[PDB]
Structures are given as structure tokens and as C-alpha cells.
């Protein structure tokens, strides 16, 4: 009766999740090490945007480092890493989703403030303030994700599969609101304010428009399906293949939401500093150091 949806669900986990997470792992690992090493080698004086972007990259690397375990468990259909790594991986996955959109919310507020006060005279525009905020994003998101621990009761299942669906749906709905929808509308609010400032007098709008687009498109199918998935586990939910179909649709959306960790290093090239030009120049300086002998140039000339 629902054997087709069941065979499909197994195929989706075995081949689709493992191939899509595998691409995210390569793209994400390369892009995030490029920009991370780029900041540690090129950037000597950091502003608010630099701090958040760097933090966004730590959040991505924390999640991307768990992907080889997920890929193997899906490809073989068995979790061999034990309970603790299962819990800690579920945490970094969700901590990445929610710290990511918050880091972008704070970059958008930085870009708006910089538009009005380019000399960073205000307390909210200082790098010491950015560090405290960054720490507060890590503390807040950890506390938002912590109630998931109560749902773990009854190999390494997705949060939407474990615990009482009645309580889990409420929590999921609050987590969608606090973690996704409110930071998204805050960016939209700051997008509107930037437009009003510009119309009264396009480059600073790029970052906010792109962040609203990327998060709207990547997080919406995942967040709708996660709430539909949990609701479909309720006793009051109708009988049939609907539950199995929803399981399949939900699985398709998960790597789409997690694409964030591979595509969000793009925000480093939208802060007006010519970072790309700095990357090639520094790379050229390491290539030109091979031929040129500065130890002999100073000694003879």
C-alpha cells in the first residue's frame, strides 16, 4: 500500500542525502578555509562585520566537520559512532542554522549603521561590542536548541522523528518563530530603513537583499516540512501514505536548508573591502617570494 514511499525514503537517505551532503562538505570546507585563512593572513584590523563573518565561518566548520559521519551512516544505513556524537552532531547542525541567520541579522544592522555613520562613532559599531554580541548569539541559540534534549526520549534519528509529537510541534513552531521568522523580519525591517535613507539622498543593499533571499528560499521548505512532519506523527493525523509521503518531502528539504553552510561564505565579498583582490594579491606575494631573494637584495643593494 505504502511500500513505494518506503522504498523511495530508503533511496533518498542512502543516495540523495549522502551525495548532497558530500557536495556541501567539499564546497563548504574549501570556501570556509579560504575565507578563514584569508582573515588570519590579510585582515589585521577587524570591524563589526569582520567579527560576525569570522563567527559565521566557525559555526559552518563546526557543522561541516560532522558531515563525513552523516554521509557514512546514510550510505551504509547504520550509525556506528554512538549516542554522545549523535547528540553533539544534532546540536551543531541546529546551532549552525540559527547562529547563521542571527550573524547575518547583525551584519545587516552593521551595514545600515555604517551607511549613516561611516566613521563607526557609535558603541554598536565597535569590534568589542561585536565580540560580546557574538558570544550572546552562541548563548541564546544554545538555549533555543537545548529543549530538543527532552525530545530525545524514545540509530541517529532526525529531531522530527523522536519524542511526543504534541509537545514537539509546539517547540518546533516556537523554534521556527524565534530562530527563523523573527531574525528574517528583523533583516527585512533593516532592508526597508536602508532604502528610505538612500531614497532621501545600491551597493550596501546587496548583502541584506541576498541574506533575505538565501534564508527565505533555503529555510522556508525545511521549516514548513519539519512542522508538517511532526504534526503527521500525531494520533489525530489521517491514516494512509500521507505520513510516508511527508517523510520523503521532509528529507528532500533538509540538505537544501544545510546548503547555507556552503553558500554563506559569499557574504565576505559583500562588505566593500575588496577582500577578493586582497586574496589574489597575498597569493601572488607568496608566489613572487619564490623567485625574489629579499635576504640577498638588502645585503647587496
Amino acid at each position, epitope marked *: 500500500s505504502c511500500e513505494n514511499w518506503l522504498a523511495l525514503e530508503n533511496i533518498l537517505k542512502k543516495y540523495y542525502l549522502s551525495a548532497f551532503y558530500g557536495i556541501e562538505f567539499i564546497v563548504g570546507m574549501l570556501g570556509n578555509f579560504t575565507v578563514v585563512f584569508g582573515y588570519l593572513f590579510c585582515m589585521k*584590523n577587524w*570591524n563589526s562585520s569582520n567579527v560576525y563573518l569570522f563567527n559565521l565561518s566557525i559555526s559552518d566548520l563546526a557543522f561541516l566537520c560532522t558531515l563525513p559521519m552523516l554521509i557514512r551512516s546514510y550510505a551504509t544505513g547504520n550509525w556506528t559512532y554512538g549516542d554522545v556524537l549523535c547528540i553533539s552532531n544534532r546540536y551543531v547542525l541546529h546551532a549552525n542554522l540559527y547562529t547563521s541567520i542571527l550573524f547575518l541579522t547583525f551584519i545587516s544592522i552593521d551595514r545600515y549603521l555604517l551607511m549613516k555613520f*561611516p*566613521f*563607526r562613532e557609535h558603541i554598536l559599531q565597535k569590534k568589542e561590542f561585536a565580540i560580546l554580541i557574538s558570544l550572546a548569539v552562541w548563548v541564546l541559540v544554545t538555549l533555543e536548541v537545548l529543549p530538543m534534549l527532552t525530545f530525545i526520549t524514545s540509530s541517529c534519528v532526525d529531531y522530527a522523528s523522536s519524542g511526543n509529537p504534541k509537545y514537539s510541534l509546539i517547540y518546533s513552531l516556537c523554534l521556527t518563530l524565534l530562530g527563523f521568522l523573527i531574525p528574517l523580519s528583523v533583516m527585512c525591517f533593516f532592508y526597508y530603513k536602508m532604502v528610505v535613507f538612500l531614497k532621501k539622498r545600491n551597493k550596501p543593499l546587496r548583502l541584506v537583499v541576498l541574506a533575505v533571499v538565501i534564508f527565505s528560499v533555503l529555510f522556508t521548505p525545511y521549516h514548513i516540512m519539519r512542522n508538517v512532519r511532526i504534526a503527521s506523527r500525531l494520533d489525530s493525523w489521517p491514516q494512509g501514505c500521507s505520513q510516508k509521503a511527508i517523510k520523503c518531502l521532509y528529507i528532500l528539504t533538509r540538505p537544501l536548508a544545510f546548503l547555507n553552510s556552503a553558500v554563506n561564505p559569499i557574504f565576505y565579498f559583500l562588505v*566593500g573591502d*575588496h577582500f577578493r583582490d586582497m586574496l589574489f594579491s597575498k597569493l601572488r606575494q607568496y608566489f613572487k617570494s619564490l623567485t625574489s631573494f629579499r635576504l640577498l637584495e638588502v645585503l647587496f643593494q
Partner: nanobody
Amino acid sequence: VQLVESGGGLVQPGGSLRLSCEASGYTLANYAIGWFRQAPGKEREGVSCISSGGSTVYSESVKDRFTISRDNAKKIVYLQMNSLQPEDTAVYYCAADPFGERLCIDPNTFAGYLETWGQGTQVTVSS
């Protein structure tokens, strides 16, 4: 490009000074120019910036008092300083960003990326 600042000296509170930033051998056309100041023991503070596109930015401390401009041929950058107060006493420097549309977005951060600076010119406001 080699930069050199002119103008500046003693001025009475309420007085005016016009500083000049010249690039002795070539045009400041493809460059963004920033005016920065440093009082003894204090941190370097951005005051004003002009983009290659002619856009102008001013710090909250000098807005509605200072005017940055480029001459007719656009060879020199000027900093007109009106209603000068003792708090404007500092060594004033100019800096040039070859990415003409970059510097004035974030002058205090992006100044850290710049290699071309002038020697500085002393401005003293006292009665």
C-alpha cells in the same frame, strides 16, 4: 603615489584653515582621499573622505564645519575647516585608496589597508 599635506598652523577658536593634500607627480583621479587626525596620546580618528566618484563623508565631530573637495583639474584634495575649536588640535594626515569607491564606506577600518599616507601637518587651535 607620494602624498604631502599643506596648510595648518596656529588658529584662534572660531577661526578657519584650509588644508591641502597634493600628489606632487600625478593626479588623484582613480583614488579615494581620506583626512585623518591624531591628537597626542589619542587614537587616529577619521575626519573626512572623498570617493573617486566625488561622494563626501564626514565624522559626527566635524560635520557642518568641514568640507572636503577636489580642485578643478582634480590634482589636489582640500579640507576647509571652519569654526575650529581647541579639540581640533591634532596632526592632520591624508591617505589615498587606489580602490576609489572603497575607503569612504568605512574610513577608520579601511585606512588600515592603505600604504600611501602623507607626513602629516600640525593644526593648533589656541587663543
